[PDB]
Each structure stands twice: as C-alpha cells, then as structure tokens.
Amino acid sequence: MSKVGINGFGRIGRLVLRRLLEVKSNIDVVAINDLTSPKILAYLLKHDSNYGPFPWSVDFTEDSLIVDGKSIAVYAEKEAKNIPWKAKGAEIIVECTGFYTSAEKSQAHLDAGAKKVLISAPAGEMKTIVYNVNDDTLDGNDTIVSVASCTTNCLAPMAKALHDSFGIEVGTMTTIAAYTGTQSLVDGPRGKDLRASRAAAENIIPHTTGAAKAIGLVIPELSGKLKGHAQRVPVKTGSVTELVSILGKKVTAEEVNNALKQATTNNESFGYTDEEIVSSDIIGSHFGSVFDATQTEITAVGDLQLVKTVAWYDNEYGFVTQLIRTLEKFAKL
Amino acid sequence: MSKVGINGFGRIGRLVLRRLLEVKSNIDVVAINDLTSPKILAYLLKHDSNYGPFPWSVDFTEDSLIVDGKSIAVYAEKEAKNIPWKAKGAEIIVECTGFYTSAEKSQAHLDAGAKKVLISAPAGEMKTIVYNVNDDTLDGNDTIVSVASCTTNCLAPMAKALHDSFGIEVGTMTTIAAYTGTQSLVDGPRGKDLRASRAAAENIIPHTTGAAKAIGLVIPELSGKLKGHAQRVPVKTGSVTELVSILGKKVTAEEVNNALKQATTNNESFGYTDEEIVSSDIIGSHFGSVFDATQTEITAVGDLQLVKTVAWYDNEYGFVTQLIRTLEKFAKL
Amino acid sequence: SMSKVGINGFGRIGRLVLRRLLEVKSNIDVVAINDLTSPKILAYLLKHDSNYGPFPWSVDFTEDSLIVDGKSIAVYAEKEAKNIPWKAKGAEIIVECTGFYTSAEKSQAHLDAGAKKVLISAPAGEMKTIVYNVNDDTLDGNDTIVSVASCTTNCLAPMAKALHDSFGIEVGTMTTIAAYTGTQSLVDGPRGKDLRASRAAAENIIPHTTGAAKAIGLVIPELSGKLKGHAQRVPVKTGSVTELVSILGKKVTAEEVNNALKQATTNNESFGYTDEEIVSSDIIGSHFGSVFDATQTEITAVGDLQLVKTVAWYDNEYGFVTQLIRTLEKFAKL
Amino acid sequence: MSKVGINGFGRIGRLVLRRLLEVKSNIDVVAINDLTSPKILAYLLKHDSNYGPFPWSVDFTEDSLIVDGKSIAVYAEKEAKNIPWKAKGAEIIVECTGFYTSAEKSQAHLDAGAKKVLISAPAGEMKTIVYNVNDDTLDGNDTIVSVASCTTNCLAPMAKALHDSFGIEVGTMTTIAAYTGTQSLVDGPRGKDLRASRAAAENIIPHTTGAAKAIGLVIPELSGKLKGHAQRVPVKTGSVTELVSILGKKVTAEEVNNALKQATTNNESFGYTDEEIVSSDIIGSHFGSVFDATQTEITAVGDLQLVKTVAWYDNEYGFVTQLIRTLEKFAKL
Ligand SMILES: NC(=O)c1ccc[n+]([C@@H]2O[C@H](COP(=O)([O-])OP(=O)(O)OC[C@H]3O[C@@H](n4cnc5c(N)ncnc54)[C@H](O)[C@@H]3O)[C@@H](O)[C@H]2O)c1
Ligand SMILES: NC(=O)c1ccc[n+]([C@@H]2O[C@H](COP(=O)([O-])OP(=O)(O)OC[C@H]3O[C@@H](n4cnc5c(N)ncnc54)[C@H](O)[C@@H]3O)[C@@H](O)[C@H]2O)c1
Ligand SMILES: NC(=O)c1ccc[n+]([C@@H]2O[C@H](COP(=O)([O-])OP(=O)(O)OC[C@H]3O[C@@H](n4cnc5c(N)ncnc54)[C@H](O)[C@@H]3O)[C@@H](O)[C@H]2O)c1
Ligand SMILES: NC(=O)c1ccc[n+]([C@@H]2O[C@H](COP(=O)([O-])OP(=O)(O)OC[C@H]3O[C@@H](n4cnc5c(N)ncnc54)[C@H](O)[C@@H]3O)[C@@H](O)[C@H]2O)c1
Ligand SMILES: O=C(OP(=O)(O)O)[C@@H](O)COP(=O)(O)O
Ligand SMILES: O=C[C@H](O)COP(=O)(O)O
Ligand SMILES: O=C[C@H](O)COP(=O)(O)O
Ligand SMILES: O=C[C@H](O)COP(=O)(O)O
Ligand SMILES: [Cl-]
Ligand SMILES: [Cl-]
Ligand SMILES: [Cl-]
Ligand SMILES: [Cl-]
Ligand SMILES: [Cl-]
C-alpha cells in the first residue's frame, strides 16, 4: 500500500504533499479531503506565505487537483467516516485536521475504507513515533499511529541524547514557538482556551503542550520525568525549545555539546549547529530538531548542577520531514 | 433613556460598551448576544490587546456580565429572531455580528421585539449615516439604519469638504488599512476571497471595499464618481485613506488644506493635523477621520490637475465614536 | 530634599521618566534634558509614542527648550557628559538613560559637570544597585552614583527574593522572553560585535545575553553566584516575561509557592500578582516592576529531585520606569 | 570587464553577490568594502532573514571572505578614497552604501583605481537606467551610472508601457512598501526626518520618494508629469506600487491589461500576473516589477477617466536582478 489520502489540506497537509514530491517519494497521493473547493486548495498550494511558490505545476477541476501533471481527487466531507477513500484506493491516511487525534476518532478512516492512519499530532496512548528516536517500534500490525507534535519532535532527539549519555533525572521545558492556526488573528472567542483567544501576532502568549508530559510514549525511561509549556510569539514559523535538566552525571558544556554532536552524526533527523543562528535561519530545515551548542548553559553551585540545552525546529517544514520519514516506513510495513 | 442590546460582542461590539461608559451615556446596555459564555466575554472585555485594561470592573455570572456593578444579560442565539430582547427591554439593537447587513435580515431584531436596529457595517440601500456629514437625514420614522464601514467614515468627511469647496468630478481611493477579523492568521480557506485566505500579519493583501462605490448613500451628488480598494497590512488597528481626485476648480495645496481645516473646526467627528504622525498615533482617536495636511499633493500639467488628499482613521475605536454619536441621536428620535 | 533633575538620554526610558513623574505628580521637577538632537525632534517624539500613545500633557518647544504642561525644560546636546551645563538650571540628580555611562567612572562625569548625584537606568558594574522594594533600604546619604539594574533584574529580583525568603534557592536559571529594544537591528546588518544582535528584530526569535542573573548578588547578596540566564528577544514592541527554574531549599507544592508569592505582593506597590490568563499586551503600561503570574507555576518532581518554575511579567519600558521613579524619589530624600 | 568591487555589503550588497553567483555570471567579485570584520560579513552573508541560507559555502580569514572556494578581499575604509581597488584588480564598483550618491562622490572609486561605478540608488542628474526601459542609452564612454531606486524600477516599466500605448498626461503614485534600514527599530532620532524616527515594524509611515519626480531621467517624455510618495508598512521585503493616471485615450481595463501583457511578453525584467497574489509571493522575484492585472481600475465620468495600475516588486532581490542586468551590460561596453 503506497496510495495515500490527506485529511486536512492545511499548513501541514499541503507541506506533506510538497515534501513527498521534493524527495521523489514512491508514495502516491491519490485523494485529499478538506472543507473547500479545489480552486481554493489549488490557490493555497500554489502560493505559500512561508515557503514561497510551489515548485511544481498546480491546476484544478471541479473535483480534483492536478499537481505536476497528476490528478488528485478532492473531497469535502467534514466527517471522516464519510470520506470515500475506496474510490481511488487510498490505504494510508495522513490525518492533518486536528479533529481526529485519538484511536477512537481516527477509526473513522478505517470504517471509511482505509487501512492505516498516521496522525500529525499527539493522539493519546497509541504508538507515537519520533523518527530516529523510536521508529524501530513501528510494527506491521500497527494501523493507527501518531507522530506527536512539532514540539515532541524537537524535544525527544535532544532528551534521548542526554538520557543515553548522562541520564535525565528530572527536567522542564519551555518552547518559544511560532504562532499557529489554533490561535486568533484578532481578540475573540477561541473555544475555551482563553489565552488562545488573543491576537497571536501582537502578543507573547503562554500555551500548554503535552510534549514533555507525554514523552514516555517516545522515551519510556523518561515517562513522568519531564514537564513543560510554550510561549507563542509573533514569528510565522520557526521555533526553539529549551530544556532545563538535572542530569545523572556532573558535566561540562563541552562534554554535553560533544555528546550531542555524536548523536547528530549521520542522523538525517537531528542536526547540530554551533553558529549564532536565529529563528528565521531554521525555516525550511530538513531536520526535526537542530541542537544549538551556542546556548548550552551549566549552572553549578557546590554539588548541584542545572543543565540547559536548546534546540531549534521549523515547526512546519522541519516537523513535516519527520512525518514523511515515518510515513515512508509505515507504508512499507 | 433608551435601553440597548448589542448583537455581536466582538472588536466593535465590546468597544461600543467601552465608549458608551466613557462618555457617561444615558443609554443603558441591558443585553448582549454572541455565541459564547459570559466567562469568555468577560475575559475579552477585561483584557484588550489594542486598548488595554477595561476602565471599569468586569465580572460574570452564568447568564450575565456585571460591569461597574451593573448587570447585562448575556444570550447565545445564533439566529437573531431567537434573541429574547424583550426580557430586559432592549429597544435599540446595535448590530455588530456581520451576519445581518440588510433591512431584511435585521428585521429579525424587530420581530424579536426591538424597535430599532443600528448596523455597524454597510447594509445595502438603507439610510446610511456618517455623523457630521449626513446625520441630519435621520428622522423619527427610521427603524433600521447603517453607519457604513470604517472606510466610509474615513472617506466621506474628506470627500464632503472637497465637494462643498471645489467639487469632485471623479476620484479613486486606496486605503492602507489594519488587518481585521475577516482575514486569516495562517494561510487557509477564508470563504471565497482568495486573498483573504493569506496570513494577514505577514503580507500586504489587496482587499475590496464598497466605500467609494456606495458613497452616494452618504453624499448623493458623488454617486457614481468614486471607486477604490484597500491594501490590508500588518498593523493591528489604525488605518489611512488616500483619495486622488479631479476637482471642479484649480487649487493649491494651501487652499485645499485651509478648506479642510475650516471643515474640521468645531467638528467633534472630523479632526485635522499638520503633524508628521504615523498610524499608531491614531489609535484611540475620538474622531471618525483625521485629515492630514502634510500629505496633500497637487500634480498639475496644463489645465490638468490631480489632487491627493489623505486622512487617518482608527478603524476600531475612532469608527466606534462615530457609531455612538449616531446611536445617541437615533435614540433621541 | 533634592528636587531638581536632569535627564541624559531622552530616549525610550528617558521620555517615560518624564511621563511617569508628571503622572504621579512628583515634587521632583525635570529642569533640563540632554541628548544629541533638536528640541523640535525631542518634542515630536515626546508628543507621539508608538507604545503608549499621545503624551497626556501639552508639548511645545523653542530653539533651546521644551515646554511641557506649560513648564520650560532646557535642552542641551552635549555628547560628552562632562560638558553638560547642568548648573545653569540647577539640575541636582541626573537620571542617566543614554546607555553610554554605565559605570561609576563614566557617570561621575555628571558630577564634574555640576550635578550632585546620578541614577543610572541600567546595570553599571559593582556599584550600589537598587531594585525597589527588594533592597532599597540599602541606600544611604553617602550614595552618590546608583544603578537600578536592568528591566530584567527588576523582574527577576522580586520573584527570587520571595523564593529565597520563603524556601531558599540553592541554584537556578532564568529565561526571559523579551520585547525587542533599540540595541537590536531593524534589518540584517552589523551591530557591533554581537552576531545575533545584527539580525532583524521584528522577524526573529533572537537569543540574547543578560547579566540579570549573573549579577543578582548586587541586589540579593545571598544568591550571588547561584543564578544564570539569558533572553530570547521576540517581535513584540514592549511587554516581556521572565521564567525562573530553581532548585529550592524545601519540597513545595504549586499552591504553596503561589501563596508565598501572593503574600510577598500584598501591599507591595512594586510587585504585582495575577491568576488571570493574561498575555504580554496586558502588561503594557503596568505600574509594577514585576507581576508574578500564578497560572504558570510548575513543580516537576522525581523523588527528592524537584524543579520549580516561576514566571513573572514585566513591561520592560513603563513598568521598569515606575521602579526607577520610586528609587529616584527615595534617592532625592536622603 | 569582469572584475567587480562592492562598496556597502548590506541588504543590496550581499544580494548582488548572491545573484551574480545564481546566474553563473562571468563577472567575479574580487573585493568588498564595508565597516566591519570579515567574520561578521561572513555571518551576514551566510544567514539571511529574508532569503534563507546562502546557497554556496562561506568562510573567512582575518582579511577576506571565501565564497564557493574563491577568495574576496575585505576592507573597512570609511572613505572610498582609501579602498585599494587597485590591489585586487576591481574594475567596476557596485556602490551600495547610500553615502556616495553623486557623480562627484563616486569619483573617489575612480581615484582609487576603479574604471567604472554603478550606484544602487538615485544619484542626481546622471544616466539612470531601468533595465529593459532605457538601458540602450548606455554607451562605452559611461563611467558613473545609477540604477535608481527599487521604486523607480517598479514605476518605470509600467509607466513606459502606458505612455507608449496610451500617453500619460499626468499621474501620481503611492507605493505601499516594505520597511528598510533607513527607518527606526524603536521610536528615536533618525536625522531630521520625523516620520523615519518611528518604529518601522509597528506603524504605517508616510515616506517621501523621488521615483515619480525624477522619472524624466528614465522616460524623458514623462518629465515633470508624475508625483508620488510611499507608505512604509511592517513587511520585511516585498512591495507594491499604485499609479493613478490621466491617459491620452479612453480605455477599458481589458485594453490596459492586454497592453501590459504585450509589454511583458518575453520581457525578462518585467513580469505579468492575473493571479490573486499578496506581497510574500513576490519575495525572491526575478523581475524588477510584476504588473498585476487583477488590480487595474478605470473610474470614468463622461470625458474624464482615472486609470489605476498596480505592479508588485521585491524591492530587495527583484531590484537586484535589474541591477545585475545593467551591470552585465555596463561591463561589456
Ligand atoms: N502548524 C504546526 O506548526 C504543526 C506542527 C505539527 C503538527 N501540527 C498539527 O497538525 C494538524 C494540522 O495543523 P495545521 O497547522 O496544518 O492546521 P490548519 O488549520 O492549517 O489545517 C487544518 C485543515 O484541516 C481542514 N479541516 C478542518 N476540519 C476538517 C474536517 N472535519 N474535515 C476535513 N478537513 C478539515 C481545514 O480546512 C484546514 O485546511 C493539527 O493536529 C496540528 O496540531 C501542527
Ligand atoms: N475595523 C473593524 O474591525 C470594523 C470597523 C467598522 C465596522 N466593522 C464591521 O462591524 C461588524 C463586526 O466587526 P468586528 O471587527 O467587531 O468583527 P468580530 O469578528 O471581531 O466580532 C463579531 C462578533 O460577533 C459574534 N458572532 C458571529 N456570528 C454571530 C451570530 N450569528 N450571532 C451572534 N453573534 C455572532 C462573534 O462571536 C464575534 O464576537 C462587521 O460588520 C464589520 O464589517 C468592523
Ligand atoms: N528599552 C528597555 O526596555 C530598557 C529597560 C530598562 C533599562 N534600559 C536601559 O536604559 C538606557 C536607555 O535605554 P533606551 O531603550 O531608552 O535606549 P534609546 O536608544 O531609546 O535612548 C537612548 C537616548 O540617549 C541618546 N544618546 C545616545 N548617546 C548619547 C549621548 N552621548 N549623550 C546624550 N544622549 C545620547 C540617544 O539619542 C537617545 O535619545 C540603556 O542603558 C538601557 O539598557 C532599557
Ligand atoms: N533596501 C532596499 O529595498 C533598496 C532597494 C534599492 C536600492 N536601495 C539603495 O541601495 C543602497 C543600500 O541600501 P541597503 O538596504 O542595502 O542599506 P543597508 O543599510 O542594508 O547596507 C548599507 C551597507 O553599507 C555599510 N556602510 C555604511 N557606510 C559605509 C561606508 N562609508 N563605507 C563602507 N560601507 C558603509 C553598512 O555597514 C552596510 O553594510 C542605498 O542607497 C539604498 O537607497 C535599497
Ligand atoms: O502544538 C500543539 O500540540 P499539543 O498541544 O501538545 O497537542 C497545540 O498545543 C496547538 O498548536 P498546533 O496544534 O498547531 O501545534
Ligand atoms: O469578523 C471580523 C470583522 O468583520 C472585521 O471587520 P471588516 O469587515 O472591516 O473587515
Ligand atoms: O539588556 C540587554 C541589552 O543591553 C539590550 O537591551 P537594552 O535596551 O535594555 O539595553
Ligand atoms: O542607505 C540607504 C539609502 O539611503 C535609502 O534607500 P532605501 O530607503 O530604499 O533603503
Ligand atoms: Cl507538563
Ligand atoms: Cl469600487
Ligand atoms: Cl564625559
Ligand atoms: Cl549568566
Ligand atoms: Cl513627488
């Protein structure tokens, strides 16, 4: 099964298609479901405020997109159980709407004729993959799987390296993160998340994330040992994650940095920098996470030591490269 | 005096209450309708990203707001015909949702028991008031009235002065305008306006407006003589309108400026500046429009002459002061 | 008491110094301003403020002065402090807000220029350094040059002080997510030798050094050498927030931390408390130097290993300025 | 000639090198003058907030950059007199500091041993080239020439087409333009220009431009016929120019757009779109100007007619592609 459907052709959904074409994947996107017309989806695919013009041709008909010459059916079923995935034989659904982030909810795609679902977000207690951290846990019998959040994909490679090298006894994370579509343009009701109701490009906005709390799904030894949250700020994409840890060994910054560099060597998912980059430098990254050695900080008083480690991440395209790596392996199991 | 209900407690709707309290109006707001809980409306009223903390105490119960110790009923009826306006005696509805911009749609407020409706937007061919341009056309028989857009309230006072002093033969308008809630935070579907789908805080976005086309409802002699559009840009509020005119007589810049100054003298609605201000200086303006003599430009070749005149406006609060001026007169009639 | 003040550096901080003094109807009179420009330009900037809106009093100017609320203020343009003619109008205390005299050696030039005392709006080495309502009782009559530290210090210190007093801080690290300022760059281009400072401030998250934690012992001596930290500069015009992750000297709950901080902010004009779901624009114009936010408190514990994260907002412009003015009013009366 | 020096390695200066390399030009940049260290110039060349990572390897020594394996000398002479252009053999100086915008000032580069100078800004009464409008006026005896402003390179192509097809009797433009390094990050003195003292990313800021006033240097028949200004707004690059004209014939929108279409066909400098683009879609443009037929507007009242035509431009990269076109030709004469 190499035929894929995308549910939710938004920021993540459209970049999923862009990245599959970019790596010349064998995967075949045969169908897209969203809430709108092919005309609007085509316009959005062609013109991207964060990544510029689509590198391939885009046209549309009344019920399809034509992308690089190839027809993709377009459906508009707001309930996944009604998506006609069998018409073009979509077997794996990349679930990118945010409305089906649980096993019970994404089961609808299987009731609708698909064989497997890969959810682009945390989805409770199910197989949750950060590629090149725990993708070896994926199994031929898995049918509904999560890639967690962009934040998880940033935190986990760094926490895995520190865990393997030094032990993490306890830690807390703050990500300073680009705003996303769950926020608001102008002050106004946004469900029941009050902070989410506030103008996102005009505020620093505290925001919850399960990235640290649910880390045990990805690194079971760290289960319950991490907590964290986000500060959403006015950049359009490109984010950074700080982890403050008590480690299991006394370290120097050079030692921490060296251990991280070894973990990023020959690692297509986890990059390393000792350059003085800022967030816009991460936009377009092909890594899920880029550890920044320039921000490593060891605070020591007598016997006590706090270790701050920092990694950048393009919460859109970078995370998407991780989603695709996982999808390619998923599709072959 | 009259009791008011507010439909749509959004950017404009909340500022309606703020301005009414600020001027210590005789009008009592007795009921609000929206789509959310009193808790969420209280949070949004108390904390404003553009105008700061609410100047009065704010609390809520399960079915009301308490503002400066006064109770305001809160309803959540998506359909205006279902709002119980009679329960608290709301006589005049300030219609601020965007979903009732016609005589026929806003009739549902009269069906539901109100006497009059003031619509905070263009609403087709009905009486359409820019205070201190044509508010004298209101009379005791009017029951559904429009104050047009923020753009009309910025265009009309300037166009009326030029018309009165020099005549306008033909003109075109461009407003460089703050983004608003009809736009998108991230690239995504926004109805059928393609350009409205693009990230508003990250782009210059061309945007249609009816202010020029429908100016004849406010200034009858200018019917058919003006066109225009908007460029929406990344400022949160505060806007400016340029009008390029062929006038009915030859003029100098000083002459235009003196004529506008006379038109703004003792004019609570229409301000004048010859200071080198920028958009943030108009935020919180108590004028619907402020003419800027520093940007007047006369381009002339032979007997041909283009006149560019420029006025600032706080599309949120400044417009609201005009809406309240009109509401205050509407209620006395 | 000393009542006549001069401002050196009529910038973001210096202009708000005047605004706040008029706001609180201080007996302190600003009689002179020094900067590098014309009265016309200084009057333009005082009248029109992108962050706080129109000046609340009238503003006019002459060729050598500003006229503010009807009161004349002399304007000088001496790039070297030693040349400022402070004695013409009798300016006694200089509020030093240029960023170019951030040491005792540098700022004593104002004394050479005829002033009696200097209050520096920034860290200024190992001199007497005051965070009001943390350690202002250490000011005495012999202090002649004083620092109020940074906006970050005025945010970090009240929170750390309450933690220190209640539970002990054995070690900690701070990250402030902070509004950009004029030390950064509008477009990518050289900005001295800080590489990251060269990058477009309104288009990036930009890591940025601060001394607030490293030098906290000037304000809370028992924490000397126990804290580190840095900043992430982000695209908001003003309004900032500081997170502190601490190992405390006691096992705690979140309610227990929040209650201690609440007690420390009670009857405290410098240090506020909130349990509302606010965002940065809600702190713009704060009359506090720091506002502890109980909704962000987080206790992470594994056995006897405990990390405590406490968070406080601050308006790095106006809120800091209110602390500067508090210290100035006390300074002038010693 | 084939050996270039760059004075002012800023936004334009760095992009000049980027573009020369992108088009595999035979011109080689042999030296750079600025005010800083090779390390900082290397950092800035490698990491670009608007265009992302440099596509070629960058490194430095104490006195040079190494770009794609080639060494480039780096000087830091505040005064062009002192730049040893001689040493490395720098024949043509691309003058991008803003501080030598006259034939008299750029004389210094010739005194220091350069043979020609191309100034990246208006520089008074000298040959001023918009490529594919008037680059044929260049001859082998030219030593110091200007490529005008980004605004001129946007206005001139559109004006030229209209003038050729219809005649422009008089007109005025407004560009809604990305903020640049001449503006302020926070409110504070910026020389004598009051509006330039204001926070550029938080404001709409009126701003003077000479593009229209000086158009006669590029289109001599339009001398003294145009005026205009700018509104600088909070986007980092990517701008748009509106021109309101009285034409010499009556026209329809379709007729205007087909005239512009024809003038842009096989026109490598001047592009055409009828797609609903927004400013970020122009970032990275390889045109000096892109005419947008979706924004054409004809306001007609009897014999009078105002024609609004609109063209997009990447004021950084797009303008640079025009500068390089002119340079390549300038170098061969
Ligand atoms: N933006 C990020 O940085 C990021 C990173 C990683 C993961 N994610 C997660 O991926 C998912 C999508 O994120 P996004 O930023 O692309 O959101 P988005 O709002 O840009 O896209 C959501 C798409 O789903 C469509 N949609 C909504 N409900 C639908 C429904 N019932 N049926 C079909 N289509 C529907 C919408 O029209 C839209 O196109 C979320 O779960 C998000 O948490 C986001
Ligand atoms: N610059 C401005 O924002 C501005 C200026 C002048 C006029 N207007 C016009 O005023 C009106 C509101 O504009 P806004 O910026 O305040 O928009 P908004 O989106 O901020 O507020 C709209 C409010 O109405 C609520 N709402 C939506 N549908 C509803 C319904 N069926 N019933 C009850 N409540 C509903 C929404 O929850 C929201 O609180 C529009 O007509 C707008 O064109 C806006
Ligand atoms: N902006 C903040 O958030 C903040 C908060 C607390 C403390 N501070 C500190 O306050 C001081 C001022 O900061 P700011 O943001 O107001 O900077 P600013 O750049 O806005 O103001 C500096 C002012 O001083 C002028 N100036 C520069 N050199 C001068 C000289 N030799 N003589 C006279 N005037 C000169 C400048 O023209 C300008 O008006 C700095 O030390 C800063 O670290 C800033
Ligand atoms: N930014 C635009 O959109 C744009 C477009 C077209 C033309 N221009 C013009 O091109 C020129 C450069 O504009 P920019 O945006 O790149 O400015 P910039 O501020 O980004 O770059 C100017 C460079 O020149 C350096 N410099 C300043 N003075 C110098 C000196 N005496 N000697 C050597 N180096 C010096 C600076 O360090 C800086 O690196 C200006 O004349 C501008 O009007 C700008
Ligand atoms: O990022 C998130 O991930 P989780 O909250 O952990 O599910 C969300 O908080 C909201 O933003 P997003 O869904 O676009 O990523
Ligand atoms: O829903 C959001 C508002 O309607 C925005 O106002 P607007 O109509 O002026 O764009
Ligand atoms: O605080 C650190 C740096 O000095 C930059 O910020 P500033 O404007 O407060 O001086
Ligand atoms: O140095 C820069 C020039 O003086 C101004 O040109 P600019 O405003 O278009 O960038
Ligand atoms: Cl958590
Ligand atoms: Cl129109
Ligand atoms: Cl000195
Ligand atoms: Cl430190
Ligand atoms: Cl002009």
PDB file of C-alpha atoms and ligand atoms in Angstrom, chain C residues 187-188 190, chain D residues 7-13 33-35 77-78 96-101 120-121 148-150 180-181 315-316 319, ligand 4:
ATOM      1  CA  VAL C 187      17.245  44.860   9.111  1.00  0.00           C
ATOM      2  CA  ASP C 188      20.082  42.301   8.994  1.00  0.00           C
ATOM      3  CA  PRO C 190      26.297  44.901  11.599  1.00  0.00           C
TER       4      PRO C 190
ATOM      5  CA  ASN D   7      31.077  49.048  -1.532  1.00  0.00           C
ATOM      6  CA  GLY D   8      28.438  48.528   1.150  1.00  0.00           C
ATOM      7  CA  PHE D   9      27.921  44.855   1.855  1.00  0.00           C
ATOM      8  CA  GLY D  10      24.362  45.443   3.138  1.00  0.00           C
ATOM      9  CA  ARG D  11      20.960  44.147   2.056  1.00  0.00           C
ATOM     10  CA  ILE D  12      21.650  45.096  -1.572  1.00  0.00           C
ATOM     11  CA  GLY D  13      25.401  44.474  -1.488  1.00  0.00           C
ATOM     12  CA  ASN D  33      34.402  47.287   1.438  1.00  0.00           C
ATOM     13  CA  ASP D  34      32.232  47.876   4.497  1.00  0.00           C
ATOM     14  CA  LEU D  35      32.703  48.946   8.134  1.00  0.00           C
ATOM     15  CA  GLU D  77      37.568  52.032   4.734  1.00  0.00           C
ATOM     16  CA  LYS D  78      35.015  54.613   5.847  1.00  0.00           C
ATOM     17  CA  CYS D  96      25.618  50.240  -2.251  1.00  0.00           C
ATOM     18  CA  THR D  97      26.368  52.285   0.900  1.00  0.00           C
ATOM     19  CA  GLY D  98      23.952  55.139   0.304  1.00  0.00           C
ATOM     20  CA  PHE D  99      26.856  57.522   1.043  1.00  0.00           C
ATOM     21  CA  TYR D 100      28.213  58.166  -2.493  1.00  0.00           C
ATOM     22  CA  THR D 101      25.039  59.082  -4.411  1.00  0.00           C
ATOM     23  CA  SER D 120      22.451  51.297  -6.421  1.00  0.00           C
ATOM     24  CA  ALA D 121      20.291  54.369  -5.774  1.00  0.00           C
ATOM     25  CA  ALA D 148      17.757  54.496  -9.466  1.00  0.00           C
ATOM     26  CA  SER D 149      15.591  53.165  -6.595  1.00  0.00           C
ATOM     27  CA  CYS D 150      13.580  49.977  -6.216  1.00  0.00           C
ATOM     28  CA  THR D 180      14.146  49.333   5.065  1.00  0.00           C
ATOM     29  CA  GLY D 181      17.324  50.176   7.024  1.00  0.00           C
ATOM     30  CA  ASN D 315      12.442  45.858  -3.505  1.00  0.00           C
ATOM     31  CA  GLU D 316      15.455  43.770  -2.467  1.00  0.00           C
ATOM     32  CA  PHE D 319      15.578  45.240  -7.810  1.00  0.00           C
TER      33      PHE D 319
HETATM   34  N1  LIG E   4      16.736  48.051   0.816  1.00  0.00           N
HETATM   35  C1  LIG E   4      16.072  48.310  -0.446  1.00  0.00           C
HETATM   36  O1  LIG E   4      14.964  47.925  -0.625  1.00  0.00           O
HETATM   37  C2  LIG E   4      16.784  49.066  -1.564  1.00  0.00           C
HETATM   38  C3  LIG E   4      16.407  48.848  -2.873  1.00  0.00           C
HETATM   39  C4  LIG E   4      17.050  49.511  -3.870  1.00  0.00           C
HETATM   40  C5  LIG E   4      18.065  50.416  -3.551  1.00  0.00           C
HETATM   41  N2  LIG E   4      18.450  50.627  -2.257  1.00  0.00           N
HETATM   42  C6  LIG E   4      19.539  51.589  -2.027  1.00  0.00           C
HETATM   43  O2  LIG E   4      20.886  50.717  -2.041  1.00  0.00           O
HETATM   44  C7  LIG E   4      21.703  51.281  -1.146  1.00  0.00           C
HETATM   45  C8  LIG E   4      21.874  50.320   0.050  1.00  0.00           C
HETATM   46  O3  LIG E   4      20.650  50.094   0.669  1.00  0.00           O
HETATM   47  P1  LIG E   4      20.599  48.866   1.773  1.00  0.00           P
HETATM   48  O4  LIG E   4      19.142  48.452   2.098  1.00  0.00           O
HETATM   49  O5  LIG E   4      21.377  47.651   1.314  1.00  0.00           O
HETATM   50  O6  LIG E   4      21.264  49.611   3.058  1.00  0.00           O
HETATM   51  P2  LIG E   4      21.971  48.769   4.269  1.00  0.00           P
HETATM   52  O7  LIG E   4      21.876  49.687   5.432  1.00  0.00           O
HETATM   53  O8  LIG E   4      21.385  47.406   4.449  1.00  0.00           O
HETATM   54  O9  LIG E   4      23.513  48.472   3.794  1.00  0.00           O
HETATM   55  C9  LIG E   4      24.438  49.558   3.811  1.00  0.00           C
HETATM   56  C10 LIG E   4      25.885  48.913   3.966  1.00  0.00           C
HETATM   57  O10 LIG E   4      26.761  49.846   3.749  1.00  0.00           O
HETATM   58  C11 LIG E   4      27.738  49.885   5.015  1.00  0.00           C
HETATM   59  N3  LIG E   4      28.255  51.233   5.052  1.00  0.00           N
HETATM   60  C12 LIG E   4      27.675  52.344   5.537  1.00  0.00           C
HETATM   61  N4  LIG E   4      28.505  53.367   5.349  1.00  0.00           N
HETATM   62  C13 LIG E   4      29.594  52.884   4.734  1.00  0.00           C
HETATM   63  C14 LIG E   4      30.756  53.494   4.326  1.00  0.00           C
HETATM   64  N5  LIG E   4      31.082  54.895   4.455  1.00  0.00           N
HETATM   65  N6  LIG E   4      31.720  52.809   3.736  1.00  0.00           N
HETATM   66  C15 LIG E   4      31.558  51.483   3.538  1.00  0.00           C
HETATM   67  N7  LIG E   4      30.428  50.861   3.962  1.00  0.00           N
HETATM   68  C16 LIG E   4      29.450  51.578   4.556  1.00  0.00           C
HETATM   69  C17 LIG E   4      27.000  49.496   6.037  1.00  0.00           C
HETATM   70  O11 LIG E   4      27.839  48.861   7.107  1.00  0.00           O
HETATM   71  C18 LIG E   4      26.077  48.427   5.424  1.00  0.00           C
HETATM   72  O12 LIG E   4      26.659  47.199   5.436  1.00  0.00           O
HETATM   73  C19 LIG E   4      21.058  52.546  -0.646  1.00  0.00           C
HETATM   74  O13 LIG E   4      21.499  53.615  -1.343  1.00  0.00           O
HETATM   75  C20 LIG E   4      19.540  52.278  -0.920  1.00  0.00           C
HETATM   76  O14 LIG E   4      18.845  53.584  -1.131  1.00  0.00           O
HETATM   77  C21 LIG E   4      17.817  49.947  -1.256  1.00  0.00           C
END
